[PDB]
Write a protein that binds this ligand. Structure first.
Ligand SMILES: NC(=O)c1ccc[n+]([C@@H]2O[C@H](COP(=O)([O-])OP(=O)(O)OC[C@H]3O[C@@H](n4cnc5c(N)ncnc54)[C@H](OP(=O)(O)O)[C@@H]3O)[C@@H](O)[C@H]2O)c1
Ligand SMILES: NC(=O)c1ccc[n+]([C@@H]2O[C@H](COP(=O)([O-])OP(=O)(O)OC[C@H]3O[C@@H](n4cnc5c(N)ncnc54)[C@H](OP(=O)(O)O)[C@@H]3O)[C@@H](O)[C@H]2O)c1
Ligand SMILES: NC(=O)c1ccc[n+]([C@@H]2O[C@H](COP(=O)([O-])OP(=O)(O)OC[C@H]3O[C@@H](n4cnc5c(N)ncnc54)[C@H](OP(=O)(O)O)[C@@H]3O)[C@@H](O)[C@H]2O)c1
Ligand SMILES: NC(=O)c1ccc[n+]([C@@H]2O[C@H](COP(=O)([O-])OP(=O)(O)OC[C@H]3O[C@@H](n4cnc5c(N)ncnc54)[C@H](OP(=O)(O)O)[C@@H]3O)[C@@H](O)[C@H]2O)c1
Ligand SMILES: Oc1cc(Cl)ccc1Oc1ccc(Cl)cc1Cl
Ligand SMILES: Oc1cc(Cl)ccc1Oc1ccc(Cl)cc1Cl
Ligand SMILES: Oc1cc(Cl)ccc1Oc1ccc(Cl)cc1Cl
Ligand SMILES: Oc1cc(Cl)ccc1Oc1ccc(Cl)cc1Cl
Lengths: 254, 254, 254, 256
């Protein structure tokens, strides 16, 4: 399947991060990987995590997506360091924790814009710069949640950033299609991760999946990873602009 | 139908503005109205336009939705001036002209955020402040475009702002529902307005409607205005979180 | 609003029928009406119900939509009897009760086809014959349920029939658009009616609305009736091919 | 990882070498699966035997099944059981309507045209699933083929559009019902491809070009491209995925 393919994975914080599910799958399929992190506070973290994978050597780059400069210099560095790439997995979002609770109508302007900034626009420059490393096409995948298509009870501002992300995926598919670059999203069902703790009611969400979703069980990081392997490889060559729900069928019921 | 109801209408620039179609319809149905504008450069403009309507007196307020302060002071002023209101029609959007062309992947961070700011978040504070003037419920309506649900060819950043606006409507419906405030959107088809001139290829868009759309003709401001009257009145009491296409059936075909 | 307009209303069984909410609304707006029923077992029923409305005289026609002949002769008779019409409200569906429970995978071929036949195809001949009584355009509205967009837990075959109904509305809107005939659907939220008793778990459905729906309450026949008045009148002239949820916003949350 | 040895799938609706189900067949066959083929007519039986020389099945597995007949679907799948043991998936690639319903005013379509289309293109999935379930003790995966015309009114698809809308719901309702038995039900919304049935759909040429001109990838897809997504849907790569409708259509479904 995937020898000699190269992918940049963005947004591993620890062993439970969705991007680490993706990482493990692609690593198993023999790909080489490039990891980006926000903070040093998870850098030495990552080095430990990497002992678990079989990279011939480490590729770790600090990228805070709030900074145009870091994304540009980051991707230029990846260029000089590994050569051309075949894909990017975007696993990045954020919002202020007090926005992710209380009345959505109460959310501040800066809260709103901050969420859009990190969870949605980041995909955009990321794509633009990644494009530079993809002469003969490639594949970009971002992670969303159902809360981007429907109002969910504690997701508020992040819901609005997901709706924004989803459209961003469509508009980038259209724009980067002629360069043979496919842009897709995976709408994951709830998984227990570090960021999951910011979302209120997350426990009762977890249980509604088990009770009402068709498969009657929750998904996990490895499951999201296997769909990312599909989206990033040539198995999905006909596929762009799409939003694939890895959520035990929850999106289909009501 | 609508005597003694009061509605704020936001975003009339001239006689061709969509919000002026809404204005005319509600004015005919005997409502009293409150108008908000961005610039003095369209204030004396508005006074002329109002001569066409039958308001017993003028209610005009400068509100730039980029400024928290102006929205708050604006709606407090309305409170003191007219008393409680029954609805708000939001007809506001903006993006940088050079973002509305060229590759979407080339758009700047500030372009992106500016568009989200005005076209999407503004609904949020608007709602929050309007809620203060709506003790026993009411109805809020914003205007969107199909470009929010699908990638269209020159809409780019505004597309991503519309996707965001539509989710904003959903999240606001959920939050304000218990206070008996309904939040809905109208996805208008292309209409020749002042802002329409920013959107590239607008002519061929206009014709695709005439050619491919079920009704085989374009809509107009008054036709948007008539649905607005429905969304804002008790006729739609069961209806919230909804997106009603006033677009000659274009949304339904492919 | 609606003096001298004429509409055919199809599928009143008793005072709790959705079509009777529509009836009451349009009758109040001063329209004249034409009623169609399946069984004599609800004919004298209807005569009683009509005492509640202010029709200058009775217009009652037996139409079983399973029979091509009855729909044709029915609508020809209406023509000779009242002249040309302005709309049709379709409120008809049926499936075998043992299909509306048990595994959906167990449903019989005849069960499936019967449900499609009455709940979906009926709209088609109805439109075709109606069109004959609509020289200068008009408006057709059918009734659907969310179960047509998502798998709901006891709806089974009727869900597949609604998905079918929804697409039939779209394809008719496209076909009858040039003759200025608008085709639309209303996706009602659960209401306690005679047919409602066939759908299992209906009670817990009713309560999920009150609990999780934005408006935090159930809708009723008169509420559906007021949206029908909008779809059928010139207020919705720009509107066709559309599905308007009258369901307290339940369709927008998840 | 590696992939699909010793998996067994029933492929339904190969008419000739251009049939979509033959793209699926070629992909799965390449991934080392064993296959079972079902056909409507003898008129395409000896057809199939020829096509199979192209694949590497250790032996032939061919079963006549007309989905209009409850009996043939039941006896067909019981025969598959006795013949090859338990299966892992089913690829459904079957639809039909009367040719004169695929043109003209949709409003003019006959009752029987309507019901016939539902019957073959939609309901068939249901009994197929019901019977297939009997050969899937520890779960499996069912995939059916649709078209965008199921979601939006397209200009010549008429009655088939209403059958696809019905097909898509059927997948959702089956996912819900068969989920607890570990059986996933999904669809692939293919973009236009030149096949035998394609010739019944009017305007098919200008459809083909709108894809090349307006679709993000600016080119048409093919059977092998549909086949590779089917491989994903049928394998454990998609374990988290049911009730879903995956567009293999160069991104056309996302633009407007
Ligand atoms: N967990 C779920 O059930 C779930 C469900 C649906 C969608 N998702 C999506 O999956 C993605 C990641 O979620 P997760 O569960 O993997 O959570 P996670 O383990 O907390 O990963 C979040 C990552 O975001 C990074 N990050 C946040 N802001 C950043 C910025 N400005 N620049 C660079 N990196 C930044 C974090 O680094 P730091 O730790 O240093 O902040 C962390 O690596 C997000 O897009 C999220 O919305 C998760
Ligand atoms: N025209 C179409 O075919 C079409 C189609 C779909 C949706 N829409 C939507 O319709 C709405 C209105 O557009 P229109 O076509 O009627 O154009 P328009 O006549 O130019 O009206 C747009 C209004 O938005 C205002 N605006 C921009 N920034 C503002 C701010 N910061 N504060 C207050 N007002 C601000 C403009 O004010 P100033 O000019 O005074 O600065 C103007 O009054 C928008 O939401 C647009 O997305 C239009
Ligand atoms: N009740 C709800 O909560 C709900 C929610 C969403 C959507 N809906 C929809 O709203 C519509 C109206 O249903 P309802 O709730 O008002 O039920 P209802 O009061 O019992 O009305 C159903 C009507 O359909 C008629 N019908 C069934 N098969 C027919 C046939 N072959 N020919 C002519 N008429 C036939 C019945 O006729 P006779 O009884 O006179 O024989 C009856 O008048 C239905 O399409 C239903 O799917 C209902
Ligand atoms: N081609 C496209 O661009 C396109 C696009 C979207 C969706 N699709 C879908 O693709 C699927 C497959 O058709 P195709 O276009 O690939 O070419 P095809 O092989 O010509 O498809 C027709 C298949 O249907 C089978 N069939 C019809 N009725 C049957 C019955 N009652 N019992 C058993 N088999 C029956 C036919 O078998 P016999 O003819 O041998 O009897 C034939 O093999 C269809 O479901 C279609 O809706 C195609
Ligand atoms: O998108 C998500 C959806 C779910 Cl159900 C759970 C976690 C998610 O991820 C986040 C949620 C909130 C914040 Cl502030 C940051 C992140 Cl990464
Ligand atoms: O959203 C729109 C969609 C269309 Cl088809 C036509 C006009 C539109 O309205 C705008 C477009 C661009 C900017 Cl900057 C501002 C506005 Cl109000
Ligand atoms: O569509 C419906 C949805 C709901 Cl919640 C309740 C009733 C409905 O309508 C019916 C459902 C099944 C049958 Cl046999 C007949 C009818 Cl009239
Ligand atoms: O549905 C389709 C859509 C397209 Cl664009 C091309 C082929 C299709 O397939 C069919 C269409 C009509 C009939 Cl009667 C039978 C089949 Cl197999």
């Amino acid at each position: 399947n995937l020898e000699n393919k190269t992918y940049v994975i963005m947004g591993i914080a620890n062993k439970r991060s969705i991007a680490f599910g993706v990482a493990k799958v692609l690593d198993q399929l023999g790909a080489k990987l490039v990891f980006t992190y926000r903070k040093e506070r998870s850098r030495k973290e990552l080095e430990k995590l990497l002992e678990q994978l079989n990279q011939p050597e480490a590729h770790l780059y600090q990228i805070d997506v709030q900074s145009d400069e870091e994304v540009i210099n980051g991707f230029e560095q990846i260029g000089k360091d590994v050569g051309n790439i075949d894909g990017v997995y975007h696993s990045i979002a954020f919002a202020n924790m007090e926005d992710l609770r209380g009345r959505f109508s109460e959310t501040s302007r800066e809260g709103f814009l901050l969420a859009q900034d990190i969870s949605s626009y980041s995909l955009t420059i990321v794509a633009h710069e990644a494009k530079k490393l993809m002469p003969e096409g490639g594949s970009i995948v971002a992670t969303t949640y159902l809360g981007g298509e429907f109002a969910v009870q504690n997701y508020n501002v992040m819901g609005v950033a997901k709706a924004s992300l989803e459209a961003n995926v469509k508009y980038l598919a259209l724009d980067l299609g002629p360069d043979n670059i496919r842009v897709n999203a995976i709408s994951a069902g709830p998984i227990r991760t570090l960021s999951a703790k910011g979302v209120g009611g997350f426990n009762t969400i977890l249980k509604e999946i088990e009770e009402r979703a068709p498969l009657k069980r929750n998904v996990d990081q490895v499951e999201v990873g296997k769909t990312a392997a599909y989206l990033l490889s040539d198995l999905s060559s006909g596929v762009t602009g799409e939003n694939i729900h890895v959520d035990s069928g929850f999106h289909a019921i009501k």
